[PDB]
């Protein structure tokens, strides 16, 4: 048998927006899971009062995506994935 061609197009996949958001979302969701846990841990460890809005920092996600769209920076670790759209002429 021959050496595998590593470029046969079938061995490619295209991480379109969907799977890409998954990456971005999934990891960013961890940053939520850890943090509440952290604060949760604190309030008990100091018997403070369990409030929800302090417990979950919403920005953790919204700020994450909005940024990571706004520039193709994707974490860093990757760039060139988000552009301004090109509205020169329809075909463009």
């Amino acid at each position: 048998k021959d050496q595998d061609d590593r470029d046969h197009f079938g061995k490619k996949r295209l991480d379109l927006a969907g799977p890409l958001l998954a990456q971005l979302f999934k990891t960013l969701f961890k940053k939520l899971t850890k943090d509440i846990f952290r604060y949760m841990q604190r309030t008990v460890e100091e018997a403070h009062d369990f409030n929800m809005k302090l417990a979950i920092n919403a920005k953790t996600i919204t700020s994450g995506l909005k940024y990571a769209l706004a520039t193709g920076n994707w974490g860093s670790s990757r760039a060139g994935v988000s552009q301004v759209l090109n509205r020169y002429t329809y075909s463009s």
């Binding site: 309030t43 008990v44 018997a47 403070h48 009062d49 369990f50 809005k53």
Partner: protein, 189 residues
Amino acid sequence: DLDLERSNRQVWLVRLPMFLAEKWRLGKIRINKSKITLLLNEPHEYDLELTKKVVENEYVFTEQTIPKKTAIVGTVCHECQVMPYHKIVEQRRNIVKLNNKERITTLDETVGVTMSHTGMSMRSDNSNFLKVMPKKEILDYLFKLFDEYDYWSLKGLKERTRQPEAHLKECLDKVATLVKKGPYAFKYT
């Protein structure tokens, strides 16, 4: 102390499709010589197919380091699987290939009502979740606790005597052995 009940109880393990095994969590074997069949108990009529004629090195045991009450039931006599009446079994089989699962309930309310809540709903703690001395009298009590206990701890004396701390220590300073070093630390004997 392993026990061998029979090790020879001839048994025919079977593999099954999902529905009947699920229905199995009786019948009548109509062997036909070897087109073995089975008349189930009402329901369908599923014959016997000989998945493996001869079955070896495989036996049935039981359970009740730590050993446990283990017995040897018997040897697998012959393996079978099942031929599943048929078209309905065929229909449900192809029908079984048509599962589904939930999508997302968007929120049909307009958004102020949905969004006023997760901010300042004005209502809090709806749920319970992690809601968290005389010089004479002091001396007599200090002598008593020291008489009661040589290891009459000072703060424990203060908590128990329920007297001002300064008065209790003064009582224990002369009526008790003021020990702040050594193995019996914080013990007033």
